[PDB]
From TrEMBL, chain A:
<dbReference type="GO" id="GO:0048038">
    <property type="term" value="F:quinone binding"/>
</dbReference>
<dbReference type="GO" id="GO:0016651">
    <property type="term" value="F:oxidoreductase activity, acting on NAD(P)H"/>
</dbReference>
<keyword id="KW-0813">Transport</keyword>
<comment type="similarity">
    <text>Belongs to the complex I 49 kDa subunit family.</text>
</comment>
<dbReference type="GO" id="GO:0006120">
    <property type="term" value="P:mitochondrial electron transport, NADH to ubiquinone"/>
</dbReference>
From TrEMBL, chain E:
<protein>
    <submittedName>
        <fullName>NUGM protein</fullName>
    </submittedName>
</protein>
<comment type="similarity">
    <text>Belongs to the complex I 30 kDa subunit family.</text>
</comment>
TrEMBL record, chain F:
<keyword id="KW-0472">Membrane</keyword>
<keyword id="KW-0679">Respiratory chain</keyword>
<dbReference type="InterPro" id="IPR045299">
    <property type="entry name" value="Complex1_LYR_NDUFA6_LYRM6"/>
</dbReference>
<dbReference type="GO" id="GO:0006979">
    <property type="term" value="P:response to oxidative stress"/>
</dbReference>
<keyword id="KW-0813">Transport</keyword>
UniProtKB/TrEMBL annotation, chain K:
<protein>
    <submittedName>
        <fullName>Uncharacterized protein</fullName>
    </submittedName>
</protein>
Amino acid sequence: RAFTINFGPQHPAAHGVLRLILELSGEEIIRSDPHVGLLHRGTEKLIEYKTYMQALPYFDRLDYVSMMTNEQVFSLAVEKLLNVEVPLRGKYIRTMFGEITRVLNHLMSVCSHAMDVGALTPFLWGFEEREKLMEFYERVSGARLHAAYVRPGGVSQDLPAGLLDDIYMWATQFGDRLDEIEELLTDNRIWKLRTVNIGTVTAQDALNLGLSGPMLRGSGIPFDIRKNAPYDAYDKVDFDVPVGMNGDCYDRYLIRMAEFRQSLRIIEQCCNDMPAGAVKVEDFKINSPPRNLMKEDMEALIHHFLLYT
Amino acid sequence: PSWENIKDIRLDPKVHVDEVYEPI
Amino acid sequence: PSVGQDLPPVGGYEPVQWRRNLPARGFRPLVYLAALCGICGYGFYRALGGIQERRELKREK
Amino acid sequence: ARQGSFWPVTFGLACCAVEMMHVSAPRYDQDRLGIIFRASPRQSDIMIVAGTLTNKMAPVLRQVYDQMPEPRWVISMGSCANGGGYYHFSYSVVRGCDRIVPVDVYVPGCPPTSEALMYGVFQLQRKMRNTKITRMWYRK
Amino acid sequence: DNTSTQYKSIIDITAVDYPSRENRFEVVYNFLSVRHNSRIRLKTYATEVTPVPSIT
Amino acid sequence: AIIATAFAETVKFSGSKQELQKRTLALYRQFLRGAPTFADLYEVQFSIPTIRTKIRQEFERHRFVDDLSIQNVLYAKGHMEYQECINFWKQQAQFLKYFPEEDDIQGRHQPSNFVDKFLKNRA
Amino acid sequence: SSSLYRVLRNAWEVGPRSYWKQLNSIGDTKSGRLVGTDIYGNKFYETDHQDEIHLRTRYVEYKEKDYD
Amino acid sequence: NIYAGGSAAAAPPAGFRIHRPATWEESEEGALSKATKYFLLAEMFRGLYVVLEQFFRAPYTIYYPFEKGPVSPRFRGEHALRRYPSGEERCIACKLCEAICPALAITIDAEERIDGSRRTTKYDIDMTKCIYCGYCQESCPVDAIVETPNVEYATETREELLYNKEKLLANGDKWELELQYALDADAPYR
Amino acid sequence: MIINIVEILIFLVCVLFSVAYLTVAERKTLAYMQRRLGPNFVGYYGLLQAFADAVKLLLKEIVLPKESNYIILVISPLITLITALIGWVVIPLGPGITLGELNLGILFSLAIGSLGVFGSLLSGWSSNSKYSLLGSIRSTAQLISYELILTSIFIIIIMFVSSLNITTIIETQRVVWYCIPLLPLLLIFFIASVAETARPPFDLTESESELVAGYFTEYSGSPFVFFFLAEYSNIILISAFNGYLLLGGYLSFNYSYLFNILFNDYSYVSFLFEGLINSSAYAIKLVFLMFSFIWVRAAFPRFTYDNLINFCWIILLPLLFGIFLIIPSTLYIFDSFPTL
Amino acid sequence: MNTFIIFIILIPIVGFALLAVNILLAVYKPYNEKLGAFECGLTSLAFNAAFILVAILFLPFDLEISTLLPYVMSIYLVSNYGFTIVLLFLLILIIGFVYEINTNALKINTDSLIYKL
Amino acid sequence: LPGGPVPVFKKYTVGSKGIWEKLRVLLAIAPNRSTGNPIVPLYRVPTPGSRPEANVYQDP
Ligand SMILES: CCCCCCCCCCCCCCCCCC(=O)OC[C@H](COP(=O)(O)OCCN)OC(=O)CCCCCCCCCCCCCCCCC
Ligand SMILES: CCCCCCCCCCCC(=O)OC[C@H](COP(=O)(O)OCC[N+](C)(C)C)OC(=O)CCCCCCCCCCC
Ligand code: SF4
Ligand code: SF4
Ligand code: SF4
């Protein structure tokens, strides 16, 4: 006879919306039935009532710690349909900010994970780095979280004048900030007690279940869309892909921790190779014209009017 | 050999292009 | 053209550190074990000396 | 005492919960003011509704509100909780948490910056500071 | 299962409502083959009363 | 693997009406049996006979549906509902949706002929 | 800088009355040059003490007790 | 050469097979050293020391509301309606802001002013629907609606968050100087 | 009678306020280890924070759930607090300087400690919230298991002294602190005092992430105050046990030379100065221990139930029985059985 | 009436006084929804042997440890005689501890894939 | 090996000076690790609202 407990919704590990109905025979989980939809909003129904430009912010708020990668997936879909090309500088900016976004997301995931197991301090240390990067978000887009910066055709605005230096200055010390978290976590035997051989997933079942990302690379399969289907400027930059072998919580932790380093490498490369030119596609039938044209030129004013109406 | 004399990046010579060439 | 755009320095930035930097520190484990044995031995020496003298004080009392 | 020991129940639902965590991050340190987020509603004064409230979640929210001992306050954080926000015309979204629980302070934003949330906290404390407790009894 | 295809990963399954067709919904399957670095899409159709065979 | 949950029945469209009516009557019996469990779970004010009356009305509503596929769909949805109720997935709020009549009188004026409907602009 | 010496030096630089005012409003002890004044009456200060971290080099002293 | 159901890229990389795990007897460290680390918790003391080192570093906190975090010209806070230096409103009821707003926050009505100008007679923003996206500000062809850097306007009831024309103009009048700062800083990038 | 009253009020006030300020000290220390500030706003430098929390909780409504035994739910925190505070009656701040100078002081400490599992054992039955029940059973198991380790270290120390008077145990340590010959025993007492107190990393009993809150999920107002107070008072008290068993209690250094320089005869000045020296030594040892509790809380992730039970019953307890064998053997070898 | 007994009496009085202050000052408004038990916000038993076994084996081991109190209080008087006796006692108990360890008392798909061609 | 350790004086972070520097180097787990605090005269200065490049920017 199974004993049924409602894990979540009001539970810090549950993240507030995970009603996880478990059935226990003593200590051991026999069946698990996650219930979702406490955060079903009808994003997909609402997008059909929105222009593409208007529908872009729906994606910021899907994975609300990886905003710019969401904007990037939607932008790539719409540009592929539109048969247009993002300028080089725009591609490089989208790569830099995709990796700043990856760093932010991994800080949130790793530190929230360690807080769930009980390690409360990396939460705060990594949250200061999160603050530093959200300064860069706010400087390029005007919002800390929901930037709406990456748009079909490129990015909404060019970088402010003093941003590359500040990113580089932060990059000179992020390495140490990582080493300190690793000092607390990588070799701690309690951490390895909580993570080694927990949640083991085989390669074949990983493929069968539809898992991707670290959840798949932890099981030994070297698959990475950035290397396999080179999108944006992921072919102009040099980085490695970490692959686990045991497919347990510890391998995935190691993978994430090394993806931190690879992201730092990519950010530095884009800081060194940022080219000049436009940031959005230069056809005013897709992206709006600069305001100095919109206020002097008839064609530009018409295109601006139509694009925003 | 210390942070009080770390070199000011902000005054380094930046790269400058005159015209950007992006083929159609 | 491109005037006033944020651009990297002509020579580029100095390379940042990104590989793992967790240098090993500490004496060898056997040195720590030897120190522990020394401290424990000296402590036992003093403790047993004190116990014996306390016994002689008990004799006097 | 009520302002100095400001204990919320965390009830975090979506993207607003991230700015709610950044309030506790080192840079703003809600703890320096006396704010401890406590998981049980039994040990909490304040509920912060930080996120889109769905129709599936409305009974649970009202249940957690009911299980807070008095005196209790509620702060509505974010556009989604204020007025249904960017999903105001969805078929499964409550158009504002004040349909479900009484609310004392509305913090606008999507998401409200951490400074805006702290300002909303200061407003709630200002409301506490002007509350008559024994003076009200004397008026009876 | 074929050696030349090997589409081991299911990516997503969805429906698209076409009210003009006699069969409203068209069910879409996306597959991914990590072996070959290739993707494929498979479509079927269904109605509000005729079911589709589950691939679970 | 991901295993089914309590009271889960795999989806099967009956090829013949009679084999469907067998399942339909089984489902009705399950609902009648579960009525007291529903009354305990959802803290209802009303009585078990009223639960059973409501169930009978629900099953009655589709008593003359002919086309087999529609019957299959209705049966599948009825079973999904039963599984929803019996596993306490549902809350009291959604459960009482089924029971609009046992709430009190909503007001003095529920119009029935054309003049009262017309006075309220509902004619 | 969290050091006690910083607090003692700022308190000496600022004077006892201003130290008590700061301890009763801000809770820290800050010493910086006055920059300007609002229409509302608050006063704004900037500091160049090297022991002050980024984002703490400007601050305000509200005019009223019920500051906002 | 010729592949059958495979390719050079699908062939395993050089060294994909992992080396066999080592047994206990093929270990470099003596049992006594391993036991020293085991019983004296070496890495736990290293972790404790790294934690203790932070205790003597400068903290990151700032003392809000006496200090403030960084704010940029592009920041998106509360809304305000601007005027021309002559004091005539800038909004000409073109309603592009109404058309682009992804949350349908904006409600506008218009008609010929008594002096013949095209102006608004009602301009509302529901600040509880707004997602603070700044499209309304990119859209307006006369810079009339803008988003101030102000975030401190929390209210005690919802009816104060339904801005009408009078409130939004008052905000513009009140924040014009800061709006000019942000405009002078960012206008070349729009 | 009057003197007795004044002594008890002085001691009680010092203990209660030390517990109150330990909470603030914990928040501040964790804060600075996390690069933040912690309470610095309620009272000057956040010195009134604990009293703010107190007053608030005393003004909070008491909720008695429907299926609960309200008497048990209200009295269980009360008894755990009483025993936690009664434990202080035997702690000396100087030779003979204590409220209770019992020849069975050690036995009193152990007994009142063994009365400490009843709050955990009873609250789960009283709350009836399921989370509380799981937490309560697991806690009762963990606490008794580690109480075994603590009692065993007590016995090992008494092997050196042959007395159950706490002051005598402290006095025997003028020759050397017992944490020098028995450093490994001191490590185990810390690891076990952490576990017996239910602190991180061994916070499985009331861990928010595995179980929301813990056994206290249902405790609001003064009952929550009691559990809180009992927990921090027990932290300080078990640091006290550590202090006088292993760190030499109120012994710091031989100040005979200094006193002979300063004074020329006995006086209330010299008695007060000696009292301050002894009490300062004992309080600095207490402070280092409390800091270490906070430090360990900052540094490590939690254990699982299986992990800590395995620890206590397979790694610690065998070592302690081995020491049971090896301490009297060393006494016998060197003819140093201690006299009464 | 020494300090000991007065302190012992005083502590429960302080506890009761704090409780009475709470009862006197706090509001008290129970209602059905508030009285519900809290389980993550919404309304809603076999155990393992090691749970039983930790508790049950606590009692013998506690008795073993507390049986050494007379020894450590009389070590000198019993000399090298009692010494040997208590070694034998300890070893006999250590045997039971070994039994417990080796039986693993407190502790709580690898087939190959073969095709018939 | 590129990406290896770089010394602490090439990192834009405050750090220590005087006798405290020597104390830090003696007592640090890894002496080349920075403290995380950005250098106030260098970092995010001039402020974004007072960049000189704003008055020269032209659409690219
Ligand atoms: C070489 C000859 C030695 C002769 C004997 C030595 C005499 C006694 C030595 C004194 C210390 C003994 C007590 C600690 C022993 C540690 C044993 C251990 O590591 O426990 C391991 C346990 C899991 O067990 P296991 O399966 O064996 O681990 C392999 C996993 N694949 O998993 C665990 O339990 C993890 C370890 C628990 C650590 C608890 C930490 C909580 C408190 C931290 C204490 C640190 C000190 C804090 C003080 C502040 C610093 C000043
Ligand atoms: C299994 C343990 C074997 C250890 C063998 C070591 C022998 C070394 C020779 C030094 C003895 C000596 O010379 O010092 C003698 C000391 C001090 O006595 P004393 O007052 O100075 O003698 C004067 C004679 N009167 C009193 C009759 C006048 O006596 C001791 O008890 C100290 C012994 C050293 C400590 C050994 C403990 C080992 C760790 C035990 C952990 C379980
Ligand atoms: S108001 Fe905006 S930021 Fe907050 S939860 Fe809703 S969508 Fe996310
Ligand atoms: S910020 Fe966005 S939602 Fe708000 S008014 Fe402007 S366009 Fe509409
Ligand atoms: S877009 Fe600008 S000018 Fe047009 S109606 Fe809106 S505010 Fe007025």
